[PDB]
Design an enzyme around this catalytic site. Sequence first.
Site, PDB file in Angstrom:
ATOM      1  N   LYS B 262      -1.081  11.219 -11.334  1.00  0.00           N
ATOM      2  CA  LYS B 262      -0.171  11.469 -10.222  1.00  0.00           C
ATOM      3  C   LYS B 262       1.135  10.720 -10.455  1.00  0.00           C
ATOM      4  O   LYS B 262       1.160   9.486 -10.480  1.00  0.00           O
ATOM      5  CB  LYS B 262      -0.810  11.031  -8.902  1.00  0.00           C
ATOM      6  CG  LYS B 262       0.084  11.163  -7.684  1.00  0.00           C
ATOM      7  CD  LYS B 262      -0.514  10.434  -6.493  1.00  0.00           C
ATOM      8  CE  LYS B 262       0.515  10.249  -5.396  1.00  0.00           C
ATOM      9  NZ  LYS B 262      -0.025   9.543  -4.204  1.00  0.00           N
ATOM     10  N   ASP B 267       7.443   8.211  -2.598  1.00  0.00           N
ATOM     11  CA  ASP B 267       6.788   8.911  -1.497  1.00  0.00           C
ATOM     12  C   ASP B 267       7.288   8.392  -0.153  1.00  0.00           C
ATOM     13  O   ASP B 267       6.933   7.288   0.269  1.00  0.00           O
ATOM     14  CB  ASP B 267       5.262   8.749  -1.603  1.00  0.00           C
ATOM     15  CG  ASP B 267       4.497   9.598  -0.596  1.00  0.00           C
ATOM     16  OD1 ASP B 267       5.073  10.549  -0.029  1.00  0.00           O
ATOM     17  OD2 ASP B 267       3.299   9.314  -0.379  1.00  0.00           O
ATOM     18  N   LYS B 274       6.517   8.180   6.846  1.00  0.00           N
ATOM     19  CA  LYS B 274       5.834   6.888   6.902  1.00  0.00           C
ATOM     20  C   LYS B 274       6.552   5.922   7.842  1.00  0.00           C
ATOM     21  O   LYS B 274       7.736   6.100   8.142  1.00  0.00           O
ATOM     22  CB  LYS B 274       5.760   6.270   5.505  1.00  0.00           C
ATOM     23  CG  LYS B 274       4.782   6.941   4.558  1.00  0.00           C
ATOM     24  CD  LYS B 274       5.114   6.581   3.122  1.00  0.00           C
ATOM     25  CE  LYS B 274       3.861   6.454   2.274  1.00  0.00           C
ATOM     26  NZ  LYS B 274       3.187   7.750   2.045  1.00  0.00           N
ATOM     27  N   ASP B 285       3.788   4.699  -6.312  1.00  0.00           N
ATOM     28  CA  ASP B 285       3.009   5.914  -6.073  1.00  0.00           C
ATOM     29  C   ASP B 285       2.877   6.773  -7.332  1.00  0.00           C
ATOM     30  O   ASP B 285       2.299   7.864  -7.291  1.00  0.00           O
ATOM     31  CB  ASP B 285       3.605   6.730  -4.918  1.00  0.00           C
ATOM     32  CG  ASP B 285       2.535   7.371  -4.044  1.00  0.00           C
ATOM     33  OD1 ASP B 285       1.523   6.694  -3.755  1.00  0.00           O
ATOM     34  OD2 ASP B 285       2.702   8.545  -3.634  1.00  0.00           O
ATOM     35  N   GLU B 346       0.552  14.485  -0.239  1.00  0.00           N
ATOM     36  CA  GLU B 346       1.270  15.168  -1.312  1.00  0.00           C
ATOM     37  C   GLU B 346       0.583  15.009  -2.669  1.00  0.00           C
ATOM     38  O   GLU B 346       0.728  15.864  -3.548  1.00  0.00           O
ATOM     39  CB  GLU B 346       2.727  14.678  -1.379  1.00  0.00           C
ATOM     40  CG  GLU B 346       2.977  13.380  -2.175  1.00  0.00           C
ATOM     41  CD  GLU B 346       2.374  12.118  -1.542  1.00  0.00           C
ATOM     42  OE1 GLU B 346       2.303  12.019  -0.296  1.00  0.00           O
ATOM     43  OE2 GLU B 346       1.989  11.201  -2.305  1.00  0.00           O
ATOM     44  N   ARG B 348      -2.712  15.005  -3.634  1.00  0.00           N
ATOM     45  CA  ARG B 348      -3.743  16.001  -3.925  1.00  0.00           C
ATOM     46  C   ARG B 348      -3.151  17.367  -4.281  1.00  0.00           C
ATOM     47  O   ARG B 348      -3.774  18.149  -4.997  1.00  0.00           O
ATOM     48  CB  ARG B 348      -4.733  16.123  -2.758  1.00  0.00           C
ATOM     49  CG  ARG B 348      -4.130  16.614  -1.445  1.00  0.00           C
ATOM     50  CD  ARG B 348      -5.017  16.273  -0.267  1.00  0.00           C
ATOM     51  NE  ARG B 348      -4.908  14.866   0.119  1.00  0.00           N
ATOM     52  CZ  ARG B 348      -5.503  14.329   1.180  1.00  0.00           C
ATOM     53  NH1 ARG B 348      -6.262  15.073   1.977  1.00  0.00           N
ATOM     54  NH2 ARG B 348      -5.339  13.042   1.443  1.00  0.00           N
TER      55      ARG B 348
END
Lengths: 494, 494, 494
Positions: B262, B267, B274, B285, B346, B348
């Site tokens: 990933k 993010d 968030k 991330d 996001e 997955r």
Amino acid sequence: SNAMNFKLNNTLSNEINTLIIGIPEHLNQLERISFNHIDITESLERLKHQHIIGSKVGKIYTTAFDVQDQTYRLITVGLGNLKTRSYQDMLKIWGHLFQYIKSEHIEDTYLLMDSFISKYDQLSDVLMACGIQSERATYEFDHYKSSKKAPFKTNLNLISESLIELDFIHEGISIGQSINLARDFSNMPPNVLTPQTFAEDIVNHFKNTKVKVDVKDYDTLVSEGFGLLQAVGKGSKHKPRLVTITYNGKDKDEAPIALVGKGITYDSGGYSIKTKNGMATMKFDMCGAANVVGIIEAASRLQLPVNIVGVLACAENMINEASMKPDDVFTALSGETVEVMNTDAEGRLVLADAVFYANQYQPSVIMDFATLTGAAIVALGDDKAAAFESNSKVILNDILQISSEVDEMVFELPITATERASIKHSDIADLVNHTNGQGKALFAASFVTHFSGQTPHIHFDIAGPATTNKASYNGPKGPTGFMIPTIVQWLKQQ
Amino acid sequence: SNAMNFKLNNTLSNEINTLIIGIPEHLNQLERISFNHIDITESLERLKHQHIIGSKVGKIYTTAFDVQDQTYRLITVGLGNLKTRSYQDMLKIWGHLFQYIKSEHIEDTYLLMDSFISKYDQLSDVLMACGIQSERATYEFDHYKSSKKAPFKTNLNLISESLIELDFIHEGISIGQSINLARDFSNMPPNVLTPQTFAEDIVNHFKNTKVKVDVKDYDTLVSEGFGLLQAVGKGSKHKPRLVTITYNGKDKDEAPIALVGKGITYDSGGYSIKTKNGMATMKFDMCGAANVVGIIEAASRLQLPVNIVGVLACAENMINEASMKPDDVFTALSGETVEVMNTDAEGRLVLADAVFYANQYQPSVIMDFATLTGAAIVALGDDKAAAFESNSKVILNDILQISSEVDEMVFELPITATERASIKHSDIADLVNHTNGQGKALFAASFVTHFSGQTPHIHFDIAGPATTNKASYNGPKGPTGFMIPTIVQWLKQQ
Amino acid sequence: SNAMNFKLNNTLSNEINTLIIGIPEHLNQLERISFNHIDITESLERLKHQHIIGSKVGKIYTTAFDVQDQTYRLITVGLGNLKTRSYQDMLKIWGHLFQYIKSEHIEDTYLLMDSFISKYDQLSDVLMACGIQSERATYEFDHYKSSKKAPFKTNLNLISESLIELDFIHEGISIGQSINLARDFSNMPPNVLTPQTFAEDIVNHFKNTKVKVDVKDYDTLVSEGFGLLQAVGKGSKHKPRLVTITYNGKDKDEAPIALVGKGITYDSGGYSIKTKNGMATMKFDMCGAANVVGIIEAASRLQLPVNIVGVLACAENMINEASMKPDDVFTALSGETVEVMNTDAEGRLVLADAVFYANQYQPSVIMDFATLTGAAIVALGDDKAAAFESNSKVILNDILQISSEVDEMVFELPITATERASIKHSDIADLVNHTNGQGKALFAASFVTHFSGQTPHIHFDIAGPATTNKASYNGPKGPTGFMIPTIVQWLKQQ
Ligand SMILES: [Cl-]
Ligand SMILES: [Cl-]
Ligand SMILES: [Cl-]
Ligand SMILES: [Cl-]
Ligand SMILES: [Cl-]
Ligand SMILES: [Cl-]
Ligand SMILES: [Cl-]
Ligand SMILES: [Cl-]
Ligand SMILES: [Cl-]
Ligand SMILES: [Cl-]
Ligand SMILES: [Cl-]
Ligand SMILES: [Cl-]
Ligand SMILES: [Cl-]
Ligand SMILES: [Cl-]
Ligand SMILES: [Cl-]
Ligand SMILES: [Cl-]
Ligand SMILES: [Cl-]
Ligand code: NA
Ligand code: NA
Ligand code: NA
Ligand code: NA
Ligand code: NA
């Protein structure tokens, strides 16, 4: 094309081995039920006594049923007590029945219509409900599923000893299909249904009909001074649209009925951003516009002698480098200045421009439909609509009556001197779009109804009942097409 | 360049007056310690008795030490009981030692290696830990500091009475440097390391090596149908990238090992934004992608006889006029439709497209590495990784064993029929990316492992252990390079 | 008494006109079905072909059915494919059937048992499921309803061509009734079921049985040094109790199995008060204790050759002038000091005293059952249980296997060095009851398992699966009796 194929006493063949009968609490209250040339009343009485079939409202019973030499599949739906059978009961009866028929993939069946009609009810109410539920209850939105099953036609062979008219069912079907049309727009994903594509779809739908559609693109609506609609939609890549829909059903130079719809294709809340759970199901923020399209679709297909002008304010409430912010002051179509203190109060802004534009047509009444306020849901619950009148106490009272008769809960909330004054509580502009005080649903209504002047105006806050999170006799989860049955019924009485 | 310069039995020089000895709980458990040819065991015993030096695991003691005429700076690190000395202890011993050496700006020193090796431990484990910690424990990211000190080389003159091979240390160094390479990418500021520059850096790094790198730009992603990766990254100015990394360590034709990472460079959560504290440290991330690069870097430098294909899904999750929203429906690379209900889920989504793409190479096993879920941290704590198997119960069991042996806490969480069913709970699409129910880490795993089909798949949720907020024997605050030691060890056994 | 009355090969009665048959996907896979003295296989085949009956697992079909002269009410339950019929399927089959029988107020019916038994499945498994579901699926708690219907007996006349033993059903019934006994305690209102009345009810229940019950009142607790149990329960008007339950199924003196249950009759959270939605359904905070009572009830009625000691820590977590507060330090039964930092972490406190007390009996294994942590629900979801082992890796593996075979989802979470150390992170006391870090479920387990010493200990966090918010084939909303089937099955194998 139709979900059900209704045929009346055309032929009786060996192909078909499925039979549908409605069962009341007391079988003697109906005229003796007969299939073919045989009285089957007492055999149904024995099955009822054995609890093989029953009368519980909307409950489905099935059994093997011998009439003469052939074995039939008997499908029973309960009717309850025929004396105390409401219109809601009829919707539950036809609803559960047609849902069972579809899920069982039944293609050919007999329907003994005489078992559904009693001495107590008028023929039109039973056949109307039958027509609506044949489309509304069987609705599904599986267009984005890879495992979508092929659509099939169910042939319903109606058997009646004294019935010739089939027009009341066809009337119900067209209403049901109008509700489903609204549902289709509502269920559409927001990345697919943008203000532009929504406008384009409406044009294409009414292209070969009596209904005229005018689309006002982004640079036209700004230069014409649609300041509030511009303000709400400027933050999106997909710019706002104004859709005008005209239907002249009586053709006279007579004052039209204005139907205004909130067409926010997606609401993020703008800079007044929604929470995680708050943004869920926000593609349904254009249900108001969708339902207006449905109402006009029904009125035109029924060829009602009414003049209608439909105004849809379409926009996408998004965040970007130049989107609307709290403290922003804009000039409305009315020429009045509006201070925006909450960007999540976007609905009343687009309605304001649309209502003022609708009033240019000099209508006899203005009716707006919108999923506006959370406070309306807090007030009346998720299953009831909030109605507000401004110079139309009489027309509202009729609608409140009609709605209670067609199984749609609508109740009045007031607009007082308090709300009429508080929409003007801005230190900078003529108007403000948000109050920090309570009674927020009343405030929103006051804001919207301000732009109609003295023209009779009814505001419908359908934030709650426009969508359902539970499947029922009226169809699956999602958009309900709320208000369409009520307004159509009202339009029929003009 | 290396942090330490390892020299074996190099000439006993008069320029060097610093000495390093490991001290156990019982000195008689080691071979009599001797420097030059002088037996110094008894003098060390007296210093230990006077509490001038000690044996506490990883504790540093220093003292003036006379051997012959010259006074030496003696540096002591405790080893504890040699019978009960774990691999973790070895990391703590070498870790604290090399950290002291660097902070004290020591450039030339003797190291009595025989004092570190016992009859209970394997020679390879001690020298491996020595090699890794010489780079890992001494890591620093001071590239953006104005007051960064000049890098210096520490010459370690190893003294051993019976040791010749130095290859086990050089093996550890290359692993340690691979971990630091991953750390460098992770520590990089998000305004500097964008998906594009991340891809460009990977190309430039492997440019003159056996490792091939292919970069799929934004236009290529969209025309090849990487719908989910497109959806996640479209909201940023810096558009997404897909990086393919191939290493053929044995054969042209043998089924490769797929390593999926990933690579979310930043993010924000998208429209599912968030909180203030939530966005802190979100440059981490992309640790999953960074650690995959590290694993491949280690495998290639060790010249392991394995075939590896690495797939990195790189994007920046941002808010703009056209970014992804809850209710949006997209078409995955698999051809399946996905309803997005939470834009903060996001990871997955990008993994789904990457896993499906990785499976085209027909791998023997797929392993994905991602900082996915907060629920995984709630489940196992911040210091443990969550592992999920799908058609690879055996390979997981080996990895769970290996990890416990290399001081990396990894534990299994299940994927049951519940999760396999709930990823399909969408009213509109084939799949949904979020549940409002609990067991969210299990849901995410089910979503990712769906796209591998029946191919053996292990999902590693490293949301917790990928970063640390506390300095230790393994290095400073920040990225840990978690999983790299475990996977490299597993790759060595193929 | 029993919900169902099972009669095997009873006299053919002229008055019974109801018939129950199980229907598989392929009727030829069963031995040719016959009723009275007539082969009815091909008539059932025609009804299946007409979709009047079907095979879908657990689906109920009813029809009029002619055999000879008399018309029968046929009740059909689908079995699916007999090759791929799991134990869960059997529970779904019997569950939905007995639920239909009860809701239809059927008092006399035939049951063709041969149609339920296949060459593919074990006979004992079918009859076990039949017995359990006859009580478990039909459970209702209507004791506080004014409109409670009168209890009735359903006479089941079993017809089998080759079956004599009925003991496997009676075995299932006693297990099902044990589950319902646990459910009754759990469903009881907290103002009715206090620690005192809970203890009194247990005494009265086992009064005339082989099971001995000892109750330790409030004065005895403080004087014997049950400091933690005292601390938790002192804030209530209804003071805490300790209930000891002994069952000697084999031997006068052989190491017993310790079963420890959390009996918090109501949890307000104490001064660490719960939110509004947090306090809802907190009468279920004693499910652990209730389920232990159920397990012992089942073991004694089955007369299993096992020795069991049950320890229940009962208290009510309330707020008053002298209730426990964060910062309070208490002395446990172990003699260790505990700092309380969170009064809502009350479960681990009462379990600690109970586990230490249980260990005095020198058991071979200690198993505790508790609705402890919210984090366990976040970890595994609401429908799975979290299991933790401490010196009992082998016994856990057996239980994890057994549970998966009896349709109960139980999965392992770890207790590592981290958790063993962090329970000691108090600046004042020996132990602390709460961490502000993550992995809270693991912490709680570490805290509880500390008090067993080196004795094999398994901790079951059933915060999720102990209750369900959805009705199913296993019964209505509320307490599930979770773990009872698993532990009973395990006890049967000792
Ligand atoms: Cl009636
Ligand atoms: Cl202006
Ligand atoms: Cl609004
Ligand atoms: Cl005009
Ligand atoms: Cl005006
Ligand atoms: Cl030590
Ligand atoms: Cl030693
Ligand atoms: Cl699409
Ligand atoms: Cl994710
Ligand atoms: Cl390929
Ligand atoms: Cl697939
Ligand atoms: Cl079968
Ligand atoms: Cl099935
Ligand atoms: Cl004390
Ligand atoms: Cl607790
Ligand atoms: Cl004792
Ligand atoms: Cl102890
Ligand atoms: Na007005
Ligand atoms: Na709603
Ligand atoms: Na898979
Ligand atoms: Na223990
Ligand atoms: Na629960």
